[PDB]
Enzyme design. Structure first.
Site, PDB file in Angstrom:
ATOM      1  N   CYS C  65      29.144  12.248  21.198  1.00 33.50           N
ATOM      2  CA  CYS C  65      27.921  11.184  20.724  1.00 33.50           C
ATOM      3  C   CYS C  65      27.005  11.265  21.889  1.00 33.50           C
ATOM      4  CB  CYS C  65      28.992   9.999  21.193  1.00 33.50           C
ATOM      5  SG  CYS C  65      30.811   9.777  20.143  1.00 33.50           S
ATOM      6  N   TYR C 140      13.412   9.565  15.634  1.00 27.06           N
ATOM      7  CA  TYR C 140      15.069   9.213  16.035  1.00 27.06           C
ATOM      8  C   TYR C 140      16.498   9.728  14.565  1.00 27.06           C
ATOM      9  CZ  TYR C 140      20.152   6.554  15.556  1.00 27.06           C
ATOM     10  OH  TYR C 140      20.922   6.138  15.589  1.00 27.06           O
ATOM     11  N   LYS C 144      18.130  12.980  14.565  1.00 27.41           N
ATOM     12  CA  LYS C 144      18.883  12.592  13.830  1.00 27.41           C
ATOM     13  C   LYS C 144      19.614  13.352  12.317  1.00 27.41           C
ATOM     14  CE  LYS C 144      21.466  10.304  16.583  1.00 27.41           C
ATOM     15  NZ  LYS C 144      22.595  10.570  17.255  1.00 27.41           N
ATOM     16  N   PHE C 173      26.122  -0.555  14.345  1.00 24.96           N
ATOM     17  CA  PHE C 173      27.555  -1.139  15.273  1.00 24.96           C
ATOM     18  C   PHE C 173      27.303  -1.461  16.912  1.00 24.96           C
ATOM     19  CE2 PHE C 173      31.663   1.180  14.302  1.00 24.96           C
ATOM     20  CZ  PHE C 173      30.615   2.343  12.694  1.00 24.96           C
ATOM     21  N   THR C 175      27.220  -1.650  20.012  1.00 22.38           N
ATOM     22  CA  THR C 175      27.235  -0.832  20.962  1.00 22.38           C
ATOM     23  C   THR C 175      25.540  -0.623  21.947  1.00 22.38           C
ATOM     24  OG1 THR C 175      25.847   0.789  19.569  1.00 22.38           O
ATOM     25  CG2 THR C 175      28.111   1.228  19.960  1.00 22.38           C
TER      26      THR C 175
END
Lengths: 225, 224, 221, 226
Positions: C65, C140, C144, C173, C175
């Site tokens: 992660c 990104y 990913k 999320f 986060t």
């Protein structure tokens, strides 16, 4: 070149089918355009119906001797919510859209292929080309497109096992998934409706490019619904 | 394509050489880049900013405006994550990712800037960017982690890039080739692809305005 | 025994929480015990994996992660996207998880299979940007997307040693606003624990392998 | 918890639907098991017939009061070549597989969802979960699998437009695409075996519990690519 190549175009009276038919004719191809009703020979047929499919193939053998190409453009894109104000999505409505979109193109494939199978292979070993029309809704189903998306998702799924099988006879199967075409602002670029002729320009490129096989090609100005 | 200025990467052999050939024959003008010599050819490290910057200046001075970018610089090495020797070298994954992904992005960001400043054609288009991924990005086999991950990042780059570049009428399209004869199990045609077939898809992409933001598999229906 | 990458916060922290509850042993890595390490660095990662073997004697799980999810256009007001920023995101997201995978796998290599023949399970965090990259997410999406493509070649090789490899592509999320409003259902940000819950479903279900699983509430960007 | 929740399960008499019904019974759920033939209440139904499907929903509305869960496991998996030794693939055979696999699951979905619609949201705001069963043939269709692949490809493609519409009511729609299972092998990378129907059931359960899973197709296949 498609000159003197014999193609069957489905949905031929208008829209994508009309544009494909026109493209083939300009390239010196021979065409049997098939549709429910009238807008290179044109015959009426329900692509869904076994006897009408059979008779159009028999017309093709008898008039032309061979078939080298099939382009499946018969299609219906209704909109209908799974849960309407009225009550649930009609079952009949869903089965019909699946029958036109998926069963009909399979029906034309099983029978067109039988014939292509018997023809002379070219230098690459190619006997035939089959192109189908899915839709971007197959991947990007929007609200109210359940029937349509399921329908074209079945077409998109069918491409590869059909390609793997018909490779034996040197018949290619490729599927185009179109976005919004000006047929009977959101789009990133070009910000406009696709012209049927652009769809036909991709169809011809598949006909010419022997390495394109078993693939679903998005033609959509990068639209994601 | 006649009198359009294209920049082509990996131009000294294989796919890039076949694309330079296709373009020139269509009457286009080509700045072919590669590390080593085999239409002008110039040495460049597609990975390096300054070097890529200088290549784009050469093109700006020399040919005036840039219409086209074909990324065919790549390496297709093969290496187990776990070998008798031990785990897959880190340097090596990083180099493959540098050449395939980082080099492609670099050529995109700089070619895009220049196309940005050009004038839109009849459809409102200012350039087309074609990228070479690989069918490895979806069908990675044993040995292909570096290549698969690297080409898979090029594939995923396509759409955010087309979405942004739409603003300027720049299209971005990626091709995912299968096995081409560049420098038996394929369903049909049961042979390696000729590079010329790859160049003809690129040419069709240039011609067809509605192709945008998509990854197109070109592989005779092969699944690895 | 689990190594969790980016364990200091976000999804990594919830994954450490969940395994901690489940009574597992965790080595948290970030810039139950923690250990400061750079996922990118060949040395830190080895020393980390060497720490884990002497201190713990096996490794059964790796959860990657470690991530940066930064925002920057290809053509900016100022000029083109910085190359080093792009390279840096690819480095953290992609080189770092590959670095962790090659090493953890070497160890899980040498351990005892369970009753299913399983020596190990590796879970990677991709993103939905890998399939729906929005403007400003090129770095990104690319990195990913690299992660996502890795899953299958990696699962196919590691099958040999009974090591599974699965990737999760989360949507949004909470986060480290109504972008939340736009997720069809449930219309909110995802909670890190729900992410951890899928990590758990995956450790538990032997038949999940070689797949990228969207966890995004039906969101398409 | 699945406790006290009422599920309808389709193709409940064997294979995947059977194991799903089992896992729900063990988690304390009320289960309406639909299928054509018998081996929680079992009823005989043709998931394709509108009246059978309406009779099953009325039944479970009157009998249990709510419906929280639809798991579609009814399905057939013929193999027939497009161009066979005998002649082309029969038309009606292909239609029939599309009708069981695709029209069937849509019929159940439209009718269940209507009912789920009319219930109270739970603590996460959820009135329902619909899990569909597609298959890996939806993406990796093998030779002879045309009808099966198209069918399931249909089911896979349905999932996102359905989750998108039904989000409004708090009904999730998720599809599993299973690989080779031991239902009525050295090929699968790991585990090198047929899946046990219990592992399918266990994903169904993960999906019922995890609110964030929605609009997606999960391959459950041990990394097998056909």
């Amino acid at each position: 070149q498609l000159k003197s190549r014999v193609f069957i175009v489905t949905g031929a009276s208008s829209g994508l089918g009309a544009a494909v038919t026109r493209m083939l004719a300009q390239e010196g191809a021979t065409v049997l355009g098939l549709d429910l009703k009238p807008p290179v020979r044109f015959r009426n047929a329900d692509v869904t119906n076994e006897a009408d499919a059979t008779a159009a193939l028999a017309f093709a053998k008898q008039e032309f001797g061979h078939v080298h190409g099939l382009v499946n453009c018969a299609g219906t894109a209704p909109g209908e919510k799974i849960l309407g104000r009225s009550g649930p999505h009609a079952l009949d409505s869903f089965a019909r859209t699946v029958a036109v979109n998926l069963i009909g193109t399979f029906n034309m494939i099983r029978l067109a292929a039988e014939v292509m199978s018997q023809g002379e292979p070219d230098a690459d070993g190619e006997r035939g080309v089959i192109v189908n029309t899915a839709s971007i809704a197959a991947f990007d189903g929007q609200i109210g497109q359940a029937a349509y998306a399921a329908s074209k998702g079945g077409v998109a799924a069918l491409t590869l096992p059909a390609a793997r099988e018909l490779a034996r006879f040197g018949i290619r199967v490729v599927t185009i998934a179109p976005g919004i075409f000006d047929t009977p602002a959101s789009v990133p670029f070009p910000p406009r409706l696709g012209r049927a002729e652009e769809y036909a320009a991709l169809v011809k490129h598949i006909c010419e490019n022997t390495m394109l096989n078993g693939e679903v090609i998005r033609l959509d100005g990068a639209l994601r619904m």
